[PDB]
Amino acid sequence: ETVCVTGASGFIGSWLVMRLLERGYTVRATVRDPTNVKKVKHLLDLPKAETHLTLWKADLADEGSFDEAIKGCTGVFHVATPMDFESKDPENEVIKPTIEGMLGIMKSCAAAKTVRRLVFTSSAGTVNIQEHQLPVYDESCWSDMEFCRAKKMTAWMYFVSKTLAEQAAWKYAKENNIDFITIIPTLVVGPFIMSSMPPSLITALSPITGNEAHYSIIRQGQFVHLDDLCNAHIYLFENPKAEGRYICSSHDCIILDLAKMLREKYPEYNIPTEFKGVDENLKSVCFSSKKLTDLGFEFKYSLEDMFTGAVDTCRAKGLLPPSH
Amino acid sequence: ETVCVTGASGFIGSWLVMRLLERGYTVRATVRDPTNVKKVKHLLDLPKAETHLTLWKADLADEGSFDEAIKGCTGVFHVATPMDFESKDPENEVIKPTIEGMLGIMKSCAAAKTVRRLVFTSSAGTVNIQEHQLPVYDESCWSDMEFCRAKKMTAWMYFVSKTLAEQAAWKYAKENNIDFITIIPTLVVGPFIMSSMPPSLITALSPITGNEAHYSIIRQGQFVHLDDLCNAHIYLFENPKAEGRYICSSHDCIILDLAKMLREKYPEYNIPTEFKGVDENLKSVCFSSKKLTDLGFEFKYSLEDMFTGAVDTCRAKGLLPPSH
Numbered sequence: 318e319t320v321c322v323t324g325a326s327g328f329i330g331s332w333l334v335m336r337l338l339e340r341g342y343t344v345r346a347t348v349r350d351p352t353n354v355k356k357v358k359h360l361l362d363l364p365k366a367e368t369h370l371t372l373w374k375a376d377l378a379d380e381g382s383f384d385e386a387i388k389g390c391t392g393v394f395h396v397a398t399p400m401d402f403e404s405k406d407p408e409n410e411v412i413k414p415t416i417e418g419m420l421g422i423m424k425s426c427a428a429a430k431t432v433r434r435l436v437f438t439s440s441a442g443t444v445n446i447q448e449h450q451l452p453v454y455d456e457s458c459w460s461d462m463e464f465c466r467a468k469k470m471t472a473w474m475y476f477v478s479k480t481l482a483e484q485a486a487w488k489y490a491k492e493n494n495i496d497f498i499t500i501i502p503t504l505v506v507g508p509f510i511m512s513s514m515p516p517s518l519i520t521a522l523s524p525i526t527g528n529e530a531h532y533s534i535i536r537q538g539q540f541v542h543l544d545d546l547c548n549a550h551i552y553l554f555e556n557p558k559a560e561g562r563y564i565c566s567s568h569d570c571i572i573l574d575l576a577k578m579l580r581e582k583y584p585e586y587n588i589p590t591e592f593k594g595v596d597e598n599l600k601s602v603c604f605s606s607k608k609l610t611d612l613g614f615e616f617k618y619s620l621e622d623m624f625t626g627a628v629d630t631c632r633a634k635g636l637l638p639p640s641h
Numbered sequence: 642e643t644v645c646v647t648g649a650s651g652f653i654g655s656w657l658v659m660r661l662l663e664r665g666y667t668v669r670a671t672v673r674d675p676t677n678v679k680k681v682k683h684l685l686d687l688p689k690a691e692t693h694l695t696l697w698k699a700d701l702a703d704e705g706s707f708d709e710a711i712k713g714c715t716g717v718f719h720v721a722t723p724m725d726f727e728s729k730d731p732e733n734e735v736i737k738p739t740i741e742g743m744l745g746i747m748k749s750c751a752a753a754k755t756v757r758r759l760v761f762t763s764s765a766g767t768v769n770i771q772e773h774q775l776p777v778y779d780e781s782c783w784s785d786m787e788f789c790r791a792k793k794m795t796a797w798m799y800f801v802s803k804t805l806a807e808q809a810a811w812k813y814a815k816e817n818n819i820d821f822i823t824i825i826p827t828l829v830v831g832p833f834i835m836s837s838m839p840p841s842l843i844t845a846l847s848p849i850t851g852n853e854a855h856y857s858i859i860r861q862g863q864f865v866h867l868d869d870l871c872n873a874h875i876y877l878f879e880n881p882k883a884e885g886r887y888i889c890s891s892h893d894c895i896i897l898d899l900a901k902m903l904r905e906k907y908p909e910y911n912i913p914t915e916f917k918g919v920d921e922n923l924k925s926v927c928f929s930s931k932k933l934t935d936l937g938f939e940f941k942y943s944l945e946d947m948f949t950g951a952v953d954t955c956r957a958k959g960l961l962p963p964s965h
């Protein structure tokens with residue numbers, strides 16, 4: 318059987334695609350510029366591409382663009398998302414498109430008459446952006462637009478976009494009886510197939526590379542492996558009884574403990590034993606996959622793995638230095 | 642004679658302290674954490690650190706904190722600026738203490754009674770952040786606070802905090818007859834002596850790294866070699882005719898000319914010969930340094946010099962890999 322996957326070129330979706338065709342699906346990859354050898358070579362080199370993979374040219378900002386992709390399949394894995402690239406006008410750049418495009422795809426999924434189920438890949442920033450961390454999070458919890466809007470802290474548009482985009486999504490799925498799952502990844506880390514440094518690993522590797530601007534997203538970290546998160550998606554398409562949301566977080570720990578763990582593995586990098594504002598008494602925050610793990614799904618991977626894969630592949634692809 | 646340098650541990654600051662010592666001066670370097678080996682090593686290692694360099698603890702978020710270090714100096718080079726580190730509340734984290742900190746550095750100077758001039762390092766984001774770009778900018782251009790605040794684009798706290806900082810200062814300097822200069826650099830690039838990756842190098846090295854978030858600053862880009870920028874801070878302290886604001890940019894080319902320029906010099910890096918949303922009739926926005934060159938200041942280094950200083954120093958220190 319056929320499925321769509323949007324944002325096929327990127328970090329999650331790529332791996333999602335390789336795993337999808339390492340099973341017996343025949344897939345419809347969607348990208349924006351099919352001629353961007355970087356974005357595409359890794360998808361076509363995938364064993365069984367000639368006989369099963371097809372590419373389609375769609376943009377979230379272009380109303381209607383997804384119909385054909387979605388024509389025919391039993392599934393769509395919406396993994397794709399706008400960045401804040403041009404960085405003049407995020408309301409028009411990142412939010413309008415992430416909202417309208419999403420609802421866009423939901424319409425087109427009905428129009429098909431073939432789509433049995435839609436899996437939105439969502440963002441952890443739809444859960445836990447509020448002025449004070451609960452010590453554990455779960456699928457009833459929603460980030461605070463009042464607080465996001467008032468404050469306008471770094472990366473607000475990737476919080477508010479996906480919170481308005483998932484919110485309005487369920488608002489439709491309930492209203493028009495669409496079969497909607499959504500997975501909520503925390504920081505996705507692992508090996509990867511794509512050509513460049515994936516966006517989520519500029520952040521995970523920040524205790525090595527010293528990119529200060531990222532420290533905040535891992536001060537009280539939570540993580541999955543790219544390979545659990547992927548198999549996790551295929552689980553939730555394939556496992557009939559699934560409703561609502563699904564957090565997909567396998568670990569959680571403050572910047573210091575991740576630092577510790579990288580130091581012991583990687584001495585050849587000069588990793589700081591201190592970070593500003595992080596004491597040893599700072600409570601780790603938790604994202605609970607209990608609802609996932611309740612269904613049957615079983616994390617195969619540990620924080621040490623995600624990272625070995627990230628460091629190993631980066632080195633290989635000559636993105637990270639071998640040492641300092 | 643004796644000068645102050647605020648945030649001595651940074652990229653700009655540190656190298657300015659190396660230059661001022663070498664030229665005969667006695668430096669009171671300020672930092673927020675002298676117990677931090679990485680910030681402070683590269684300063685005590687300077688020749689003449691023993692005899693002509695003392696160290697001080699000050700933080701712009703602490704009212705009064707620069708009195709001691711400013712005391713006794715003929716000049717004060719206020720270069721230090723807050724980062725959006727916690728990334729919870731940039732109004733109170735970034736802006737308030739840029740501005741308060743600046744006004745505090747001014748009152749301290751007035752009250753030291755030996756400060757004959759205070760050079761402040763502004764930012765280019767004070768000049769040219771507005772909807773549509775002028776083809777040339779000079780010392781009379783200010784950013785548009787209506788437009789930063791109506792849109793809240795990436796980086797907006799960095800723009801506003803510096804524009805209200807530099808503004809409030811001028812209003813103060815005038816009202817009290819304080820000799821005062823500001824230098825607006827552009828994205829500063831070149832060699833360095835700091836031991837971690839300079840934050841602005843994370844931007845200039847974007848084509849090599851694939852840091853898609855940092856392309857907007859170099860899309861219509863401008864530049865200044867670090868060594869010029871420092872000889873110009875010293876030049877403008879030492880030059881009696883100097884008044885008001887003073888642009889320090891020496892080159893201006895679109896992302897395409899930079900990626901091309903690097904590609905010819907570093908074939909071992911795949912650098913993309915194509916950029917999304919950037920065509921070849923995209924004009925270059927220049928920052929007119931003419932006010933500064935009319936005084937007699939002479940720039941000594943080309944676009945290439947900067948990027949071979951930053952590339953070499955990084956390879957040596959091990960923050961950019963040798964190849965792809």
Ligand SMILES: NC(=O)c1ccc[n+]([C@@H]2O[C@H](COP(=O)([O-])OP(=O)(O)OC[C@H]3O[C@@H](n4cnc5c(N)ncnc54)[C@H](OP(=O)(O)O)[C@@H]3O)[C@@H](O)[C@H]2O)c1
Pocket residue numbers: 323324325326327328329330347348349350356375376377378395396397398399400414438439440441479501502503504505506515516517
């Ligand atoms: N990685 C993480 O730790 C993390 C954590 C939680 C959630 N997420 C979510 O996971 C999903 C994938 O993230 P990732 O790190 O795998 O992203 P990624 O590697 O950057 O891929 C994002 C993809 O979306 C596509 N894209 C950008 N603008 C688009 C538009 N207007 N229309 C259609 N596609 C567009 C890009 O593909 P083209 O360049 O081909 O167009 C890109 O490959 C996103 O929904 C994100 O919000 C990521």
Ligand SMILES: NC(=O)c1ccc[n+]([C@@H]2O[C@H](COP(=O)([O-])OP(=O)(O)OC[C@H]3O[C@@H](n4cnc5c(N)ncnc54)[C@H](OP(=O)(O)O)[C@@H]3O)[C@@H](O)[C@H]2O)c1
Pocket residue numbers: 648649650651652653654672673674680699700701702720721722723724738762763764765825826827828829830839840841
């Ligand atoms: N670099 C550029 O291309 C660029 C372009 C135009 C203008 N500028 C400006 O030039 C200055 C230096 O830039 P840079 O690249 O050298 O940046 P940087 O490398 O990050 O240096 C900034 C310094 O500020 C100090 N600092 C941070 N927060 C502070 C606070 N809250 N109170 C007091 N000091 C604080 C830090 O030293 P400690 O941690 O040890 O205190 C740090 O070393 C800034 O004013 C910046 O905006 C930079």
Ligand SMILES: O=c1c(O)c(-c2ccc(O)c(O)c2)oc2cc(O)cc(O)c12
Pocket residue numbers: 439440441442443445446502503504516517518519520521534539
């Ligand atoms: O999609 C992303 C996401 O959800 C989060 C995140 C993770 C855990 C949290 O607890 C949180 O509040 C946000 O970080 C990110 C960091 C990146 O560099 C890139 C991303 O794409 C995400």
Ligand SMILES: O=c1c(O)c(-c2ccc(O)c(O)c2)oc2cc(O)cc(O)c12
Pocket residue numbers: 399400401440441442443471472475476479516853854
């Ligand atoms: O810096 C980035 C960032 O902070 C996030 C983010 C973080 C937390 C979230 O919850 C979320 O939904 C997105 O995404 C990104 C995606 C990119 O392609 C590029 C980036 O540079 C970022």
Ligand SMILES: O=c1c(O)c(-c2ccc(O)c(O)c2)oc2cc(O)cc(O)c12
Pocket residue numbers: 529530724764765766767796799800803840
């Ligand atoms: O993302 C960043 C950014 O855009 C700027 C910037 C841009 C224009 C300006 O005028 C200015 O003063 C600063 O500084 C930074 C400094 C850091 O330490 C870390 C960052 O992540 C940024």
